[PDB]
Design a protein around this ligand. Structure first.
Ligand SMILES: Nc1ncnc2c1ncn2[C@@H]1O[C@H](COP(=O)(O)CP(=O)(O)OP(=O)(O)O)[C@@H](O)[C@H]1O
Ligand SMILES: [Mg+2]
Ligand SMILES: [Mg+2]
Ligand SMILES: [Zn+2]
Ligand SMILES: [Zn+2]
Lengths: 95, 157, 105, 729, 554, 315
DNA sequence: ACGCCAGACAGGG
RNA sequence: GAGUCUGCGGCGCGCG
DNA sequence: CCCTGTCTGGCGTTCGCGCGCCG
């Protein structure tokens, strides 16, 4: 199946919430630039025509791989709706 | 590997004065077993042309220096009268099975490729019968019977 | 740009009929063969309903987008794609009233 | 009532012709009225097949007639019944009306008879739809034969006696769907009507009178009858069947040959030798492999492809017309206005494609030139044309191309120009152009095959002869059928066909087992006893005896209960062979298969590959005019239906957006799909759905009716679905 | 942990395996179970090929006792005839008695054939597939080695004469033609039965689609009590309900109240694992509990929707239900499939009794979801509601409904029938007005709203006296609040007529209405509980805090 | 009002009705203005009312027919809005997906529940846009329109395209559907493993969920476009993730007919012959004697001998 | 043709 | 800097 | 005028796909 899906399922209060989180995460992953990640260095996402998955294969595949770690934070109202998209474009470069 | 009937264009045609259809012919060709003698012969095109009230067998092919035909009496066709059959059938050295679709040979533009049948062996069989050696009766004896279309011999194989 | 949150069915006021309406079909004239164009006032006239074609009008006085919101001087044709032609509604002014069978039977 | 002649094989058509229907004028009987009509009545005996009734909604209403069944003077399917005066049966027969049949006491054909003499005091008879044990003295009439009970299509089933009526149905139906193989082989085990089929059908070409053969062409066989007359018999070379199957008459008589009255000169589309043939006789091992042969799924040997054993021909008739537009006549010419010569080679003759040309999907079969717009040129395309070369054939490329899927080689071409001979060219239609394309189809994984009994199944894997199950002697098995598919299903007739077939393989002979009267378990064991000597006898003389393997399997076999313990391996294997099973080695490991496995000559046919077989995958394409839902047809596949049941499926899951997508971005959201595409092209994140045209069309459809449906805001206030075309002016 | 959940003391049957996967599911985890699934898949396939099991005509082995039992019953037939030829047995008794002779004699050859294999051929190719959850049916194998004996006439009256043959030996000429009638009548059966399976599903879905999990533990602690014992099999003798059915009732449910049973304290709200339901059964065996207090959709508070503690465990997953799940639908789909699964497999494969079983159920499950006086007045719900009250009807419908599915092999959790049947009583008639005239049928919970604020917030206690109304699934869908939903099934014609007249504002809630629009689903990712959820990186967390720090002016 | 074939024109029957109403209403206006003899005015008002019914609902009162050709009730508005294949049903069930596929299914034994065998030839059409862009990211194609033309013909595909598609589908998943979708497992998500041919390789264990068996039946296939749909599809929809059934808490990934038969055979114990003494339980002479008696032909390796049949004593 | 629901009117106090 | 127009309603049969 | 009963009037009746024909 998929990497630690049960680990992931236990991390959220409701099944369908994890789904929304991963999805919204995959969205930002692409929009503000694909380098908006929290665990790229040593062991990270990878494909094999070359090791090129390091750049842009599957968005959510990363989101899950990150949420599996304890770096990200998902809440009902964590950071004010509009101020987030502003600070995010200010710090992340790829366009 | 390929065939070329002079007046024929497609594989689904029928030639006058010839009972068999191109498809039945090309089929009978897959049955022809030839045997060349050296690497220098990678691709040999056998030529044959017969006319009139004669039966076309594999021995009718004009003989080529380093090539031999171990399938002489194979029936290629039955010509009635005014039966004009002039063809060129290519022959190659390869391995395994190669669908006519995979190689697509084109000596002549109107020629039609044929399914490749490369094993010189039709069937193998082995038996392991107990044999007795003075001390311990529990022993194996292998005897394998090999059949070959003639191209190569059982021992060579 | 708002979100659709409630739908509502309400009977129609004669005036609302006309309100949604554009032109009145007053004759059974579909299309005249010669020219596969709308006959006269007919069930297909472009006035009452819209531009049979893309951005072009009937006769061709005005044919592109530059003058997208104006009507042709001799023939009446305001034009968006033939899409405006499929969304617009026409009306028929009945002589003596009749009634919705939907509410009667 | 008139439909496409089902000519998968002449048999198919013949059946389609004799199947009895209720529905019709509309005056007689309608479709949601008929539980009493649908049932198979008593008198349907030898007048209507009780199995030919197609499975599906339309059922029971349609059913082919029986064997000897024949409409007398007035639509009363009379059935043949022989007279029996006293204890004496006659060779005289009376086609009787169904009413008259109830007045007499009739008996079955199974009654022991010494000639004219009944043989048992208490022998079976049926008064009126009621089983009755009658005395030879009361036996007024007897049935003619077991065949009459059933239809033609059904009488072609081997041991129909051992198969469950319901599973037999499938058998009969399957035949009607048999596709003509270049290599036609009659069954290893037949019923007795294969001959009669092709002959009463007009598959094969029979000799009228006795005579000798003059010319044997591939197109005609001119025979010379002994009456001093000679006739030229053309042979339908390659014709297009309504269903697109090939119909060729293959001469089977050599030059100068005395022919018997009524002998096949040429074989029909699917006849081997005057025998009906749909599919071929192949050695088959009835054991389970990895997962390849699933419950209904079945395997296949690459060796079967090597010799064209399961190969068939399909011809298609593509057609195109040169219409007359008021924009300018659509011309047919070699001129394909915009890009290459590489695509114009095959189009040798000015406009038409040259015969004997291999056309792959996407090639030009026929070239045609129509006009670019509806009535006006293009201001944007006017600047593009002028920049590189203004003088560009204003005409657009509207050429008949090979639709995705496939094409083969062009065999024939038809063109009807201006001065028509005696043809009926439709109005506006300037000229037409037909392009027949043929292609050789080789048995592949997707295909489906089935035996006359009922085991149906698709090919799961084409294994190389290298490692499939092989017999002690190098002869490997052709197909491996899964056992599990026969317990639950009741049709041991198949297991009975494989046993006698086994015999026929080593005894080099075909057999004919009647319906209920055919071969019997003892008689088969007998023939099997004769095959052992051919099998194991040659082995003894050829020089070798038994294997470590062959003996190992015997151990486990005695411990099983198949061979009497204490007898010689030679005698035991015989006993085991009689049981219909022989030892087989894996082929992949050379190890045997612990436990004897039956094997034999089973007749299996290939089922017609409809365009429902040739799969469909759609990315983007056409849309419906009134509804804005995706639709295909010609070259663009067409979208799949998502049905509410499936909706519910996603609904169950938290598949929100997945559900939205389906209802918006993928089908109806006009603006959505568009933006959707571009977005994906860009590798962007798809925009947020706009209103679905379906709702819009709904709204208005509802507005058509008095009702006014309006969308509202947070506070009961408007919101607009129709972005802005609703406001007036 | 592998040997703890495996039974190596018997041949692995589909059930022993079925049990292993389930165990593995709960014990080791979802994906770990998936691994085991493929593992058994692989080895099962491999070993299958090597085992060399294959059918052979001879494999089908006929018992020697067949000839006996046939003759034994044969001579007995002659007794019954002579008993008739004298005038003792009435025309009827004759018939009823002959049938019973075969009904038993057949069942006799049945166990016989198996007895042969059991003792003599343990590894008969045909036998192993049936025992293993592989393939085969006891009534099927009988028709091959034993003999399929009684095939009824066109009408229904079974034939006086049986079918003495098996499929091993030639089923004769006329015995085939007679069997043929039974096949014609069947094929038709599945067609109507398939149409009512979809009927059952559409109805269930049309009434139960708005029902969705959106909550907080609903504080209303009122519940249903699941009975562990059954009254009259034999006049009056209390008995422990069958294992399977009891499991069905309390598996993965939520205790409405705390129960102290054999020594352990089952706390309130705790989700009872199958191990727990094993405990309670063992206790009832001892005699400590006769019913069980458990949360059920049957007593939820959430007007529109069901909470997490009321529903239970079973999401596709084995842990408690996750908020925003489309339960009702799942239920509806689950009742549809079983209908569409059982009548298509019975016309297709085998006999007498089964034909009656399927045809009697489909009519009964259509009369049970829709409210009407049953054929033979079985008992009528409307009247029963009036005389004995609601809480009994609810528990009656549920159990009476499980009765047909248990009897047909299907195993569906009571959960589902509940969600449905609750909606059949989400409505009530009025007897004492306040806001609108008396005779009216309206939303139960909508009355709870009126009465609530009528006595609590605004004074003047105007009791809104209602009567529990038991409407059938069908009628509930027909007449609901929104029109969009109603415009979908009954009469688009009617549905809209009324909804127009009275300017109806379809507030979009529920999946059916909201789908039509092609709008996001109010449930799932649209679920109000999670439609809004943001994600952050510790990097963007500090950044936004730097924006709040710059808020300090000069 | 469309041009069909050869000059045939198709129009929605509504138009016929509309005419009806139009003419009557006109004819009425003129009949009131001309002169109005009572009889003929009502006679017409009658025809008019009727006509007004025709467009809205036909059949509630008599059934109008297109002139002698088809005694068919011209589809009235009411009709266009009511029914199984109606408009209200059309919306509800959302009928036709843009990224869908359907082919014959075939067992794929080595495949894991996690994946499914999907024909590459099919994957190409389905994942066409997703590939077109991937073509540009690599050197196989300059632009989109270029990438399109590169693939409009089968003989034009460079092996390089396959590598691209195989790369696009990396971790995306697709949904499979079966003929009657009875329950939620009626659709499952799997990881496509591009394969050659026409057929689609399905896993055996799920063949229980979908009531499917490789005999003439065929399964459809869809693809999640949004990163969101993708997420849900692979997290909560994937086959392997929906192991228990919604009906019962009992598994649905139960080994089927094939697997059970294999796993059974391997675990069953055999019994054979007891003619001479079966009591090893007590004597030590019983061990020796019946151990040699077994070596002989009297006692089998599996003898009904309580404690241990000689089969156990020997090994 | 059927089955089912819901309905509007007519007969017996 | 490509995009129009055709495939509709019904009937018959066949798959699973 | 009431309640009960009886014929009466309206709707629904799997799901998707192939092919071929016809105005
Ligand atoms: N009239 C009909 N309506 C709907 N589906 C039908 C149908 N006839 C056949 N089918 C469908 O296609 C399948 C064909 O039947 P089978 O393959 O025999 C299923 P089954 O129940 O597994 O029987 P089996 O165990 O003998 O294989 C059924 O599952 C059913 O879903
Ligand atoms: Mg099945
Ligand atoms: Mg099936
Ligand atoms: Zn103008
Ligand atoms: Zn609750």
């Amino acid at each position: 199946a998929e990497p630690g899906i049960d680990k992931l399922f236990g991390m959220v209060d409701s099944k369908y919430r994890l789904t929304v989180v991963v999805a919204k995460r995959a969205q930002q992953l692409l929009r503000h630039g694909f380098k908006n990640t929290v665990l790229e260095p040593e062991e990270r996402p990878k494909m094999q025509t070359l090791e090129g998955l390091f750049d842009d294969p599957n968005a959510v595949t990363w989101a899950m791989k990150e949420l599996l770690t304890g770096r990200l934070v998902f809440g009902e109202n964590l950071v004010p709706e509009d101020r987030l998209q502003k600070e995010m474009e200010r710090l992340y470069p790829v366009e | 590997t390929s065939v070329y009937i002079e007046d024929v264009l497609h594989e689904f045609s029928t030639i006058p004065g010839v009972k068999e259809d191109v498809v039945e012919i090309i089929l009978n060709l897959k049955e022809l077993v030839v045997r060349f003698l050296n690497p220098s012969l990678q691709t040999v095109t056998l030529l044959l042309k017969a006319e009139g009230p004669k039966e076309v067998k594999a021995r009718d092919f004009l003989p080529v220096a380093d090539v031999e035909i171990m399938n002489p009496d194979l029936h290629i066709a039955t010509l009635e009268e005014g039966g004009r059959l002039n063809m060129e059938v290519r022959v190659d050295r390869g391995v395994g099975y190669v669908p006519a679709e995979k190689h697509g040979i084109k000596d002549r533009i109107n020629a039609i490729p044929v399914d490749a049948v490369f094993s010189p062996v039709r069937r193998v069989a082995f038996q392991v019968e107990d044999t007795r050696l003075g001390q311990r009766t529990d022993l194996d004896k292998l005897t394998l019977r090999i059949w070959t279309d003639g191209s190569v011999t059982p021992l060579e194989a | 740009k708002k979100e659709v949150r409630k739908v509502r069915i309400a009977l129609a006021s004669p005036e609302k009929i006309r309100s949604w309406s554009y032109g009145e079909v007053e004759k059974p004239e579909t299309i005249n063969y010669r020219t596969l164009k709308p006959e006269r006032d007919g069930l297909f006239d472009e006035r009452i309903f819209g531009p049979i074609k893309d951005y072009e009008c009937a006769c061709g006085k005005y044919k592109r987008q530059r003058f997208e919101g104006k009507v042709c001087e001799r023939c009446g044709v305001e034009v968006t794609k033939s899409i405006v032609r499929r969304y617009r509604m026409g009306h028929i002014e009945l002589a003596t009233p009749a009634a919705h069978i939907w509410f009667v039977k | 009532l008139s439909q496409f002649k089902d000519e998968t094989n002449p048999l198919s058509s013949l059946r389609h012709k004799r199947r009895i229907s209720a529905l019709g004028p509309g005056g007689l009987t309608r479709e949601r009225a008929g539980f009493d009509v649908r049932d198979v009545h008593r008198t349907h005996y030898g007048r209507i097949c009780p199995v030919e009734t197609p499975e599906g909604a339309n059922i029971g209403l349609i059913t082919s007639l029986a064997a000897y069944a024949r409409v007398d003077e007035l639509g009363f399917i009379r059935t043949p019944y022989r007279r029996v005066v006293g204890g004496v049966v006659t060779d005289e027969v009376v086609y009787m009306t169904a009413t008259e049949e109830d007045r007499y006491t009739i008996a079955q054909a199974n009654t022991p008879l010494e000639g004219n003499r009944i043989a048992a005091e208490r022998v079976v008879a049926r008064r009126k739809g009621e089983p009755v044990i009658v005395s030879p003295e009361e036996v007024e009439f007897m049935d003619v034969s077991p065949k009459q009970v059933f239809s033609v299509n059904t009488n072609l089933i081997p041991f129909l006696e051992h198969d469950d009526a319901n599973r037999a149905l499938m058998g009969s139906n399957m035949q009607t769907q048999a596709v003509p193989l270049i290599r036609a082989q009659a069954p290893v085990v037949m019923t007795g009507l294969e001959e009669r089929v092709v002959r009463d059908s007009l598959a094969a070409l029979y000799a009228e009178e006795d005579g000798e053969v003059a010319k044997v062409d591939g197109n005609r066989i001119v025979v010379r009858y002994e009456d001093g007359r000679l006739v030229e018999y053309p042979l339908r070379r390659f014709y297009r069947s309504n269903q697109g199957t090939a119909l060729d008459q293959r001469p089977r008589v050599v030059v100068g040959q005395r022919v018997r009255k009524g002998d096949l000169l040429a074989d029909g589309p699917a006849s081997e030798n005057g025998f009906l043939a749909l599919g071929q006789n192949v050695l088959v091992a009835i054991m389970p492999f990895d997962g390849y042969n699933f419950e209904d799924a079945i395997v296949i040997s690459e060796e079967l492809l090597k010799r064209d054993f399961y190969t068939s021909i399909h011809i298609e008739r593509y057609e195109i017309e040169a219409r007359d537009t008021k924009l300018g006549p659509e011309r047919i010419t070699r001129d394909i206005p915009h890009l290459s010569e590489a695509a114009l080679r095959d189009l040798d003759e000015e406009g038409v494609v040259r015969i004997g040309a291999e056309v792959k999907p996407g090639d030009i079969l026929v070239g045609r030139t129509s006009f670019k717009g509806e009535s006006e040129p293009t201001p944007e395309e006017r600047l593009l044309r002028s920049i590189f070369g203004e003088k560009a054939r204003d005409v657009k490329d509207t050429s008949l191309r090979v639709p995705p899927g496939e094409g083969g080689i062009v065999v024939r071409t038809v063109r009807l120009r201006r001065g028509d001979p005696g043809v009926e060219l439709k109005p506006g239609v300037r000229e037409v152009v037909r392009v027949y394309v043929a292609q050789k189809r080789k048995l592949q994984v997707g295909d489906k095959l089935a035996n006359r009994h009922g085991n149906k199944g698709v090919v799961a894997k084409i294994l190389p002869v290298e490692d499939m199950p092989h017999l002690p002697d190098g002869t490997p098995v052709d197909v491996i059928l899964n056992p599990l598919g026969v317990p639950s299903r009741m049709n041991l007739g198949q297991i009975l066909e494989t046993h006698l077939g086994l015999a026929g393989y080593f005894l080099g002979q075909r057999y004919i087992s009647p319906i209920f009267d055919g071969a019997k378990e003892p008689e088969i064991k007998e023939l099997l006893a004769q095959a052992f000597e051919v099998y194991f006898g040659k082995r003894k003389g050829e020089g070798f005896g038994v294997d470590k393997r062959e003996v190992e399997v015997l151990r486990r076999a005695e411990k099983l209960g198949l061979v009497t313990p204490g007898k010689t391996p030679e005698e035991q294997l015989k006993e085991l062979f009689l049981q219909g099973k022989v030892v087989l080695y894996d082929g992949r490991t050379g190890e045997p298969i612990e436990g004897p496995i039956v094997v034999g000559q089973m007749f299996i046919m290939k089922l017609y590959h409809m365009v429902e077989d040739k799969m469909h995958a759609r990315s983007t394409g056409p849309y419906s005019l009134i509804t804005q839902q995706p639709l295909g047809g010609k070259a663009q596949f067409g979208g799949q239906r998502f049905g509410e049941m499936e909706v519910w499926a996603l609904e169950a899951y938290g598949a929100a957006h997945t559900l939205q997508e389906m209802l918006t971005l993928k089908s109806d959201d006009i603006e959505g799909r568009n933006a959707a595409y571009e977005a994906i092209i860009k590798g962007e994140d798809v925009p947020e759905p706009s209103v679905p045209e379906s709702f819009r069309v709904l709204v208005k459809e509802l507005q058509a009716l008095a009702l006014d449906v309006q969308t509202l805001d947070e506070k009961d206030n408007p919101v607009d679905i129709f972005e802005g075309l609703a406001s007036k002016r | 942990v592998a040997w703890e959940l495996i039974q190596l003391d018997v041949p692995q049957e589909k059930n022993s395996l079925k049990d292993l996967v389930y165990q593995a599911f709960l014990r080791l985890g979802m994906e770990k179970t998936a691994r085991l699934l493929d593992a058994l898949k692989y080895y099962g396939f491999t070993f299958s090929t090597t085992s060399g099991i294959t059918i052979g005509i001879d494999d089908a082995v006929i018992p020697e006792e067949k000839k006996q039992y046939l003759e034994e019953a044969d001579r007995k037939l002659l007794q019954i005839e002579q008993a008739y030829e004298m005038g003792f047995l009435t025309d009827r008794e004759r018939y009823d008695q002959i049938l019973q002779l075969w009904t038993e004699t057949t069942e006799k050859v049945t166990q016989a054939v198996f007895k042969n294999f059991e003792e003599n051929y343990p590894f008969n190719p045909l036998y192993v597939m049936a025992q293993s959850g592989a393939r085969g049916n006891p009534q099927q194998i009988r028709q091959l080695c034993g003999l399929r004996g009684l095939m009824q006439k066109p009408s229904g009256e079974t034939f006086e004469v049986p079918v003495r043959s098996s499929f091993r030996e030639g089923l004769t000429v006329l015995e085939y033609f007679i069997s043929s009638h039974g096949a014609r009548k069947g094929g038709a059966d599945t067609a109507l039965r398939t149409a009512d399976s979809g009927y059952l599903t559409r109805k269930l879905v049309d009434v139960t689609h708005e029902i969705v999990v959106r909550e907080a533990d609903c504080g209303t602690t009122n519940y249903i009590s699941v009975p562990l014992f059954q009254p009259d099999e034999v006049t009056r003798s209390l008995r422990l309900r069958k294992r399977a059915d009891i499991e069905a009732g309390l598996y993965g449910r939520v205790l409405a109240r705390e129960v102290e049973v054999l020594g352990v304290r089952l706390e309130e709200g705790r989700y009872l694992s199958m191990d727990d339901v094993h405990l309670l059964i063992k206790a009832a065996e001892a005699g400590e509990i006769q019913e069980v207090p458990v949360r059920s959709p049957l007593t939820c508070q959430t007007r529109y929707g069901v909470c997490q503690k009321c529903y239970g465990y079973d999401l596709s997953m084995a842990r408690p239900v996750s908020i925003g799940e489309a339960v009702g639908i799942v239920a509806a789909q689950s009742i549809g499939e079983p209908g569409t699964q059982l009548t298509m497999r019975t016309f297709h494969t085998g006999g007498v009794a089964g034909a009656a079983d399927i045809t009697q159920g489909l009519p009964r499950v259509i009369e049970l979801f829709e409210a009407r006086r049953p054929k033979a007045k079985a008992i009528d719900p409307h009247q029963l509601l009036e005389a004995k009250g609601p809480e009994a009807v609810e528990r009656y419908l549920v159990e009476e409904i499980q009765k047909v599915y248990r009897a047909q092999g299907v195993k569906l959790h009571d959960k589902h029938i509940e969600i449905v049947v609750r909606q059949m009583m989400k409505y009530v008639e009025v007897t004492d007005p306040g806001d609108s005239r008396l005779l009216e049928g309206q939303v139960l919970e909508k009355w709870d709203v009126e009465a609530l604020n009528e006595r609590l917030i605004a004074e003047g206690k105007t009791p809104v006296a209602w009567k529990p109304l038991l409407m059938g699934v069908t009628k509930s869908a027909l007449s609901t609040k929104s029109w969009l939903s109603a415009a979908s099934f009954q009469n688009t014609t009617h549905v809209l007529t009324e909804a127009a007249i009275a300017g109806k504002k379809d507030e979009l809630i529920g999946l059916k209405e909201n789908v039509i629009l092609g709008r996001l689903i109010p449930a799932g990712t649209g679920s109000d509980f999670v439609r809004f959820t943001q994600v952050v990186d510790q990097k963007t967390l500090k950044a936004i805090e730097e924006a709040r720090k710059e808020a300090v002016e000069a | 009002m469309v041009q069909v074939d050869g000059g045939r024109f198709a129009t929605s029957d509504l138009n016929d009705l509309y005419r009806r109403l139009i003419n009557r209403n006109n004819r009425l206006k003129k009949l009131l203005a001309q002169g109005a003899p009572e009889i003929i005015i009502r006679n017409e008002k009658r025809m008019l009312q009727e006509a007004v019914d025709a467009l809205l609902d036909n059949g509630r009162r008599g059934a109008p027919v297109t002139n002698p050709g088809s005694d068919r009730p011209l589809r009235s508005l009411t009709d266009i809005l009511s029914g199984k294949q109606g408009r209200f049903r059309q919306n509800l069930l959302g009928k036709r997906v843009d990224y869908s596929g359907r082919s014959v299914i075939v067992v794929g034994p080595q495949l894991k529940l996690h994946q499914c065998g999907l024909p590459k030839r099919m994957a190409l059409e389905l994942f066409k846009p997703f590939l077109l862009k991937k073509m540009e990211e690599k050197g196989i194609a300059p632009n989109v329109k270029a990438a399109r033309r590169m693939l409009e013909r089968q003989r034009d595909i460079k092996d390089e395209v396959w590598d691209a598609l195989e790369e696009v589908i990396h971790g995306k998943v697709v949904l499979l559907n079966r003929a009657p979708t009875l329950h939620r497992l009626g659709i499952q998500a799997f990881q496509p493993v591009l394969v050659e041919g026409q057929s689609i390789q399905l896993h055996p264990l799920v063949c229980e969920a979908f009531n499917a068996d490789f005999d003439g039946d065929q399964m459809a296939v869809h693809v999640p476009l949004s990163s969101f749909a993708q997420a849900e599809a692979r997290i909560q929809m994937l086959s392997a993730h929906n192991l228990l059934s919604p009906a019962s808490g009992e598994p649905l990934a139960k080994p089927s007919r094939d697997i059970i038969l294999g796993l059974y055979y391997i675990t069953q114990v055999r019994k054979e012959k007891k003619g001479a003494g079966l009591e090893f339980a007590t004597p030590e002479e019983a061990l020796a004697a019946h151990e040699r008696g077994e070596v002989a032909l009297n006692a089998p390796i599996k003898v009904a001998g309580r404690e241990t049949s000689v089969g156990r004593l020997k090994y």
